[PDB]
Symmetry: D2
Amino acid sequence: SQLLNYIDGNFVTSASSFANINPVNGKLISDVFEADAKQVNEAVVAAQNALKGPWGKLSVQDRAALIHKIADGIQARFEEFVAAEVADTGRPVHQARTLDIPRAIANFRTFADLAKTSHTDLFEMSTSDGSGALNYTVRKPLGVIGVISPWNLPLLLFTWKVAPALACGNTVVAKPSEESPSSATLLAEVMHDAGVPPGVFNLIHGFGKDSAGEFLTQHPGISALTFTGESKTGSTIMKAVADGVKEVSFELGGKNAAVVFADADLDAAIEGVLRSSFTNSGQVCLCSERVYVHRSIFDEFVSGLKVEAERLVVGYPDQDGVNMGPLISHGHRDKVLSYYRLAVDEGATVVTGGGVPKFNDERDQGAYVQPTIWTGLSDKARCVTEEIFGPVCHISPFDDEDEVINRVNDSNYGLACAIWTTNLSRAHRVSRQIHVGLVWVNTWYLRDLRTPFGGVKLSGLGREGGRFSMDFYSDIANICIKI
Amino acid sequence: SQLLNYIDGNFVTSASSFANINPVNGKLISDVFEADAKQVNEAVVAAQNALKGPWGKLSVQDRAALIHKIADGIQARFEEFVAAEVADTGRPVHQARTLDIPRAIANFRTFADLAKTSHTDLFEMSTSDGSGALNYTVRKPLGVIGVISPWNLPLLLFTWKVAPALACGNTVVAKPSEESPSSATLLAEVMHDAGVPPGVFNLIHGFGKDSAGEFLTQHPGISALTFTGESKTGSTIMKAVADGVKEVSFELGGKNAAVVFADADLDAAIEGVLRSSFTNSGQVCLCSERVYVHRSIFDEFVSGLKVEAERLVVGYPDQDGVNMGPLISHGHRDKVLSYYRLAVDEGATVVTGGGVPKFNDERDQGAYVQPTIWTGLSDKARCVTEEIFGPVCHISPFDDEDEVINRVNDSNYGLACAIWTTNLSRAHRVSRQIHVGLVWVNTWYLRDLRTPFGGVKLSGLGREGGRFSMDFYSDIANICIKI
Amino acid sequence: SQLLNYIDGNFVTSASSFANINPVNGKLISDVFEADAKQVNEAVVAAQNALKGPWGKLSVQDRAALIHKIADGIQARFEEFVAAEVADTGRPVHQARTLDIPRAIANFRTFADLAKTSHTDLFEMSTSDGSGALNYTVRKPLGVIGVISPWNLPLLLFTWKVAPALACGNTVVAKPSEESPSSATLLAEVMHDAGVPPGVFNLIHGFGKDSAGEFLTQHPGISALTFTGESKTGSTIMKAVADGVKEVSFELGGKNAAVVFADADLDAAIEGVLRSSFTNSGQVCLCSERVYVHRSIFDEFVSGLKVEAERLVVGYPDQDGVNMGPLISHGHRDKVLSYYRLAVDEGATVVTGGGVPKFNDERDQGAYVQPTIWTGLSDKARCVTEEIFGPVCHISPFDDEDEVINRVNDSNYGLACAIWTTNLSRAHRVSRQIHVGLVWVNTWYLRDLRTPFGGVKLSGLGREGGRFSMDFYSDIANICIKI
Amino acid sequence: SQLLNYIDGNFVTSASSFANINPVNGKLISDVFEADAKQVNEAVVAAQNALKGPWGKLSVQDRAALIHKIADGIQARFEEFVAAEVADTGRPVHQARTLDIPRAIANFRTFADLAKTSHTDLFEMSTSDGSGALNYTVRKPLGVIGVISPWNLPLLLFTWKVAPALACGNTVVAKPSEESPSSATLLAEVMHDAGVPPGVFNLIHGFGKDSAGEFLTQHPGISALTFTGESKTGSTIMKAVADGVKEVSFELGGKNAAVVFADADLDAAIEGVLRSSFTNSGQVCLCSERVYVHRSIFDEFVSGLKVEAERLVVGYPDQDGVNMGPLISHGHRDKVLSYYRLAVDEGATVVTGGGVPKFNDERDQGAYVQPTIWTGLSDKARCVTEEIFGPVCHISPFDDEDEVINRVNDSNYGLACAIWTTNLSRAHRVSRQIHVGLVWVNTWYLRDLRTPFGGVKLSGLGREGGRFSMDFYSDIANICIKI
Ligand SMILES: NC(=O)c1ccc[n+]([C@@H]2O[C@H](COP(=O)([O-])OP(=O)(O)OC[C@H]3O[C@@H](n4cnc5c(N)ncnc54)[C@H](O)[C@@H]3O)[C@@H](O)[C@H]2O)c1
Ligand SMILES: NC(=O)c1ccc[n+]([C@@H]2O[C@H](COP(=O)([O-])OP(=O)(O)OC[C@H]3O[C@@H](n4cnc5c(N)ncnc54)[C@H](O)[C@@H]3O)[C@@H](O)[C@H]2O)c1
Ligand SMILES: O=C/C=C/C=C(/O)C(=O)O
Ligand SMILES: O=C/C=C/C=C(/O)C(=O)O
Ligand code: NA
Ligand code: NA
Ligand code: NA
Ligand code: NA
């Protein structure tokens, strides 16, 4: 199969392509045309031009309706979206069916709804002459939005940036991850078939450095760049846009902690930490790679977790009760296994996992690894401070509330934390002292799309979610009328 | 006179120093101790540690009452602050008495109040098990805020940053412009005498490149950098913080237009452009350096403005009916005089001014220039497109509304615009189509401190003012409780 | 046997019926079953109980979706709703097609959406013991809402109350006007077919006093009473609910003015006042019955308006260029004719109309009156102070701005006013001085469902629209957690 | 001591005077001049004219400063206000100094602040012709506000209404309770000395029926009636204003419950219920008169409470560690002892209290009763269902969460509830199911002035607190400009 760019209402190829690899089994799924500078430029210019076309004349109610028509379009090809996401990533079918695609549909519908009910402010004031004045605010499109996205929840995160950009009347030039270009390509078809005017949504394929990613980022025609990926890539991109002083919104790594206090419901914590460490084969920015458990229940916790971890079915996306699929790619398994080793050297006890499973079939040419649990490491070990982004956690005991708060916060990252406790005072007292953007108490990755959703310190810049997306993807302008 | 740094509750000197010059007569006002990389380091460390002391334990109410006392202490020393801003900048006394110092006072009071009345959000949601969940947001300090401010409205822009930073419970390290250090140092004294705990507010004197400015900007202990200055300086600072992925807030240059339509109140428009072009001797980012006037009134508008500009009194800050002081320094005057020549070279008719007035007294050693009006340059001329930041405007005719709108918007800046018309529809039809952060109709620089206040494109990054300042100087964190 | 009640999920008849008459020709359209005290009680109890059934358990997202299915179900029977509205009221078919039915559908949609996007508040505080507390608010259904609506925009006004009621999770007992019951009956069939659970929406037919209206108003089981109708009926209802201290929300009469200044677009103003005085045969609470025109344009305005008014086509709802239908009933027609005479006794010049047109066909048995224009009455004439609710305006000259503002405000009502001027200052300076809930400048009855939409003084009690409807139809509860 | 009315800038006496009696010892404190209908009229008319005078021309920020001046005036006479509250009511001096007087000051300050920070809304919309329109809202004074307040928290509740009234630019005619007129009279003095324009604040003394209160309530010149007091008086007043359709805001009775679960911190819960039942001698609308305790800890709870209640000191307001003063009056004490007898007749075990203490001094001429606990009554008993408004609670066991929720909600009132539990889920699951305006978990009457603060069912009509007071005390008007 072939994946083409979508520029100014046209599918187009390039002077080059790269392969897209299925990671269940190393096989080739598709050729993907790499967008070059000229093609990027042609994309930005057409998104510029589309702002002064029929898109820009739509009322907010008619724009909202079209976006709902985009969402209806995805629902109408639902099983194709599932297949494309799975194929690219190895994600279990069931989870692409209940989380990834439905969420993408809800991203468009939610931001269309926000854009319809959103309004601005009126300020009255007195003047020397006694006649007064009015200041009012108006909401406009920011302009052309560059969107660069990652591979771990391809459609979910691509639509999280694209839906609010379009809802706010912007136009978009979007560059999905090289590793998962398929669901995005299908979206371009949904856009086209829905009647989205040419130039409004442009899809470019490519890599980062020296490819479409970077050219987008350096193009003076964009007004903003929203990005999700590695912290180091954020810093790079921040440098690249600096001369145009472009608006930037970044969601970046974390090294997230879960915390289990003595008075937690132990079973629920074990189950919750299981999900939080090994969901999507631990390839979510939100996953817990450090776990702190109070000393009085530490051994029981580690035993319980070891057991549930070994019951995880690691297999075919469509295999009966499968829980995990592979990593995204071999290159990413190379990094993960490299942490697995570094853990050993640094002194870790391997409670479970620690290498790759053996299938005796095509999956052995894929990119699977095992759910791993470590113990024994100190707070300064590299395997406890750096993001691995695999199905791994380290577990460590603690004694004191103040102590464990300090240990959770002793990080250059700040995305999420989960806390397990049945106590009312503790939950609210400890939550507010954790230096992260998202705390969950007795659950994990529960989602309400109205909330601010982002991290502090190296884990982000700005916030998105709810009115914070409405603010980022819009230009607020103040008009003052002297009376 | 000597101006010391203020670090961790103590006024301190440095190993080096530089001169503060009175632009009215070129004389020495004070010596100012440059802070080195090392002292910048102490100020930051102390500001970090101040977060974990008494300041960090005050209620929102007590924090606000202490900020009201800062304001009372400026008020108690009102005339000394007036004298300080005048000496540094040459500004007319009446302007410092009515705009500059009362605004620095109201900036503290406004943000104190905003901090008392501000709340966050509560979201309720259903969950699969029927028990529901709550997500609530809380408002924390961002951390250490680095503040770097310009020389044109020194205490006003300085406090516009420091007030919300402190009201949101941050600690601060602030670097005022080398050209206008006095009011900031007096402010450090007020802070001290009001009992602001040590480390909350730190004042570091110095320059930018390879100095205090640069150092603050590179220190990893800061959580954010807020800045007002040149667009290119913004670009540099954005590169400098990119490795730490620090929150950034920028208010940068402009090349602002005023538009005078045929049905304008002409005499009121002439007066308004006079004020918008020549206030503070054109040294305000808000000033109008491009002016568009409908062809049927262009010649009469030009003649009227000439007359009014030639009546302006250019002189001592406390001279009788003084309207305009000098430029900030000889170096800035060199830059302005250079653009004055450039305009003649690009074909300008000099309608008035275009040189330096001759006093035959001490002021001739100062940094004065004449108010200047040009005519006859094309929209491509550099003088019509680059920020001069002097008492100058160019005046060009137009015939058509859509035409003028495109000429205003054809610029890389987007700070402000003023429009003059008596027509209800036009006011609101035209205003919304200007691609700037601030439009005024039939006035200029009329302020309501609740509004968003900043520009688009090269004129800004983020927004401040009202709840935009509270959003930027706070960390908004989400807490999700599964019920 | 044609129009039934709908109580607890079944259509039911009653012990007595009353005639519904077509105002186009005085013919019987239907027999309507009048609910008695016992049936009103059965409806309140069933609504009470449905709050504890499945309706009570739906999530906000699912409730909203169900409300969108109510909307979809109206859309699917679009032409039957049109035919129903037209049959009861004689409204022109094109108007029912473009205003009445689409707005009823959008009422349901807009409020479903607001229910989904609305959130509440979170307040942090300090406490003496240094642990702090949180206060947060939650929105809950008020309970059973009793809805009593009028005959002039039947489905539009009925759903304007029913949609936010249901959107906030209440249940409803709703009594449409005796003169226009058909569209509400069809609405119940839509509710039924959409699977709205039994008891959630209940329809009772009848009159006011000694009938279903009054009984609903006195029943101790309702939590609120929302009403649209005459002021005097509002007072009676406020007394009836007083022992129960029920929440109330009333939208009552007005005696609205239009004001035309010398600088208006005169042709637009004549067209504007034509719509504002004669739309729906002047049977809209928002219609202009008093017009003030500046003396320099008075004769011209009056002459232009005469011509336009005598070009209005008064006739059959499906007749070719029809503009006006009949009045709602012979009873309402006699009230209006009684005012037409009083106008002549009080000294009015009849510029046009003043009686009933002669059709020489079955329309002569209907309830038509002519569009009428008066001149020469005094500001204290009863015809200029009491609401007529017919297709009638009096036009009076004025001279000064202060004077006409005082005459507009000299009224016990305060619903709406329209102002015609092209001057920017005047628009904003006058509009703000008019003591009404709604001012339109250079237009009339322009509608944005997000806005507060009601009147002051005798014209209203409380306020609906936007977040104001969400406030009224919700119970807001504050929960305080000591930490 | 004499207490005059304050009408139109002047203190004035009346044709008749009544006695204010000190409830500690039955001695005469003052004569109070009852206002008659003519004087009420005089007040309302002055208040109307005051809206067109200097008060009406104040900027918001000036109005606010002046309200801060009122608060400073009270702060300057702090101990005189303390002595005046104490003498009228017998409340402990420490309660007056820590709650009553400071809250009255903070009411004025909080609302002044809110008046300065508050803005309104801007709605942009499309129109047929593609030019669009704008809807903006403005905030105006409502008009004259009639205020009627009770005797239990005289100055706190009086100023809780007067303050937001004045902050929103209304004028006021206010009638304190005949039982507690002194602090309000001193408030009139403060207003006058603060330069509050004549007619802006008017004070009238008297009773309800056939006196100042009724007459206020029936005057056509008021725009609204805010009222705190018994539910029955609520109804009477809602009737009286019905002919005028005046805005109304009522805070009314309750029969509040406290619920102690098995996992409560029992000693904290005992202290909390002791404070919630016996503060101000149970004469707060917020007090718990019904308490439910889990069966497993019921006996231990009652024992513990008995001991603590028997250690309460009942006596003079300045007596050492006094906890309770007398009831407000001999009449109120007759009502309370009536309910003490009824309880015995209905079968209650008197756990402690149940009579009047014996003092052997002037306190035996006062209106003291003992703190009283009952056990053994059924949910239907009158003493468990009707509001007593003295220092009494009944305690009953329970077994199941859903059961105790139903028992609390089984009431015609819905003011407040307090819940004691250490369990996180329980606090939030149970809180949200209680049908009241205000729930406290692990505390009672902890207050943040930003919150909504009122009850549901018979306990209330409308809501005040934070922006709910700004909504009630303002006229929000919508202006729509066709562009
Ligand atoms: N919301 C969040 O906080 C969040 C969520 C999920 C994943 N992540 C991150 O996702 C990452 C997975 O992807 P990765 O390791 O390949 O990240 P990456 O930063 O290398 O690249 C992700 C995206 O950035 C593009 N890119 C890379 N270099 C670029 C450059 N110089 N200029 C422009 N674009 C460039 C890539 O093509 C891709 O589309 C993880 O490292 C993790 O930190 C963050
Ligand atoms: N938004 C507004 O402000 C607005 C809008 C449209 C119409 N109106 C009013 O609509 C009115 C239509 O005339 P109308 O005779 O229908 O007004 P009405 O007040 O007599 O009747 C309106 C509704 O109230 C019910 N009703 C009448 N008396 C009652 C009683 N004692 N108890 C309970 N319910 C009672 C009626 O049966 C009907 O459903 C006009 O007179 C006009 O004032 C107001
Ligand atoms: O953003 C990073 C992980 C996100 C999960 C989401 O559901 C989301 O971003 O919308
Ligand atoms: O910020 C640039 C000019 C600012 C003037 C102001 O009044 C302000 O920033 O507050
Ligand atoms: Na792949
Ligand atoms: Na200087
Ligand atoms: Na009819
Ligand atoms: Na008394």
